[PDB]
Amino acid sequence: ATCDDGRTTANAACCILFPILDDIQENLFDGAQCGEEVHESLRLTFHDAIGFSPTLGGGGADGSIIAFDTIETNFPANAGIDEIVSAQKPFVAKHNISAGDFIQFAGAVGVSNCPGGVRIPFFLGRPDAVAASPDHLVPEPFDSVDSILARMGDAGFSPVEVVWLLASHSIAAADKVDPSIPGTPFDSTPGVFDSQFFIETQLKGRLFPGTADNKGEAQSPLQGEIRLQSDHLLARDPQTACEWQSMVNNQPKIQNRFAATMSKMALLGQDKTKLIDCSDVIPTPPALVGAAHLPAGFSLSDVEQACAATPFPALTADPGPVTSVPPVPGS
Template identity: 30%
Template sequence: MAATLDNVELTAHQNHLPASTELLGDLITLPQNRLSQSGRAIRQLLTGSGNPESNVESFFKPSVRSWWCQVDSCCVWHHIADDLENLFRGESGRCNKFARQAVRIAFHDAGTWSKATAHQGGGADGSIILSPDEMTRIENSGMSEVAAHYMRIYHRYHVDLGFRSVSMADLLQFGSSVATVVCPLGPRVRTWVGRQDSNASAPHNLLPNPFGDAASIIELFQNKTISPRGLIALLGSHTTSQQHFTNFSRPGDPQDSTPGVWDNLYFRETLGSVAVPERVYHIPADSNLAQHDTTRAGFEMYGRRGGQKQWNSDYARESIRLGLLGVNNINTMTECTRVLPRATQNFSSKDQRKIDRWLKNLDWSGVWQDVSRFLEEGHTVRVSEADLQI
């Protein structure tokens, strides 16, 4: 009976929140009889069918200097995936600050495109790192560390090893897929490569304001072909995060009680449907969206019992859409999902009792600051419970 009621509730939410079915890039004008395998698959995903997640794996990883890596487009990405997994996964099993920055920087690169400004460029083109000024924009604060890692990886594979097909545009979106699946419980998003780089600066004022009102943010995303449902699915990535640049007086405070874990607790805590510890900081725009008539249902749908599966699927579909904004050669792209790390489908933090104590205290000095740092680095919290007395 409970399962039946859950299904009725889910259907009601889905009917209230339809997903976008708009096509993008060259798929808008290409007839279906001219679509490649990738073009057909992506067209299905953009129009609401097909599975946006995949557990297909490649167990064959030749040397990066082998002839095979010269003929198989995904071979080099297998090596890059391993490098990124090592960068993003903490010894606690949680994902770390580099993974969180990777998801964010991929959005900030792609999200600079809109239907109204498409003639000005922007989108998933690598310009957030390759342009002379985008990383200095205030909205891009807090991502310089992962940008530096990406530059090193790009230089190694694109320059030193001569893989000219490895673009910064792909590295950013591929990195987001790796980061998402490295975070425990995160989806394994189907992932394509073949984007073209640009060093031209993207248009301004196309990313959401963390203090923005819900109506303005909804309109901003709809102009990117992302529906209110898609917006809330993407917003859920805040489940892993610890903010530094929205409220400077609360550095390292998380957006839900399980930072570094890709669970749906974020939706319930932002909505206020469960008790929320003092240290959990709700980004003002997130709170505004949680209470808005158009988007509240999304928080309810994803935060419900069993909502994780629906959220992961919707996030994967919207992440694919996001990573194709401004891309006009979708039909020639290559799917490389098979080289992504495996998903972690079950997880519990062995140090959650210590984290729970930290969450109840609003001290940002001494041992309390140490806990924040351990969590950001993906480490097990290495302080005693006695030191965390409130």
């Protein structure tokens, strides 16, 4: 169907999304950039939807994190999330869709601004949240692999699916893990949806980018990069090691799987059959920029070979001296 402004879309309901598309590209994402706001909004899809336990409750991908923002933004594991919630609230006021829909929508638009990213399938028509999330449902960076895999499993994700979702950390930084160094990314390309994250998390640590005494932080391989202890454990754990390494220099797998599993996540606590497919509204992502590599100065013997089925792929290292990682511009 052709919308009131010439732009087209399979279903006519989806038309209402075009004004919101523009609003958030202009006013949320610094004109369509893969930066802080995009990263936080992606993070927000998870903190919303992960609020889903058959044991403890929660409506999952329901926009509760905004609807019930006084409760949820005050959970420990939600530290820092208040910023992007209070930035999105006004958009939700302004426009005529539920908070649940918006979070997923914004996150989908956001990812699509990242080189090498993908169009996460998006559905329209989530009812309002009817309850806040229980606490203790968001995985923390200092939790054990078992603890985390059980939590994700309680929510409906197999171990391999957790790896796929954690592709998100290829375009991500931390503000609260070490508050002395806000904006410190998880891989050396926070602005590119690539394999660098799965690569760089497998290296032997060298140093600590800020202070060393941080809960939930592992030793980093690179100056200007933070390593979550969780990612460090997951990248080496028997259940996940080989899946983690399978992602290395494997952009099609990162792309297809991330998209597919994100779609599952976005539809937690929701019935796909009572929603409306609006996936063609999401902009077309840019192609991958740069190619897989070990950081400059590094080699294959920096790699901790956790996977037993397969060797680490014979990557080459960037030319030159060990360089450091520039932060995410923001704050």
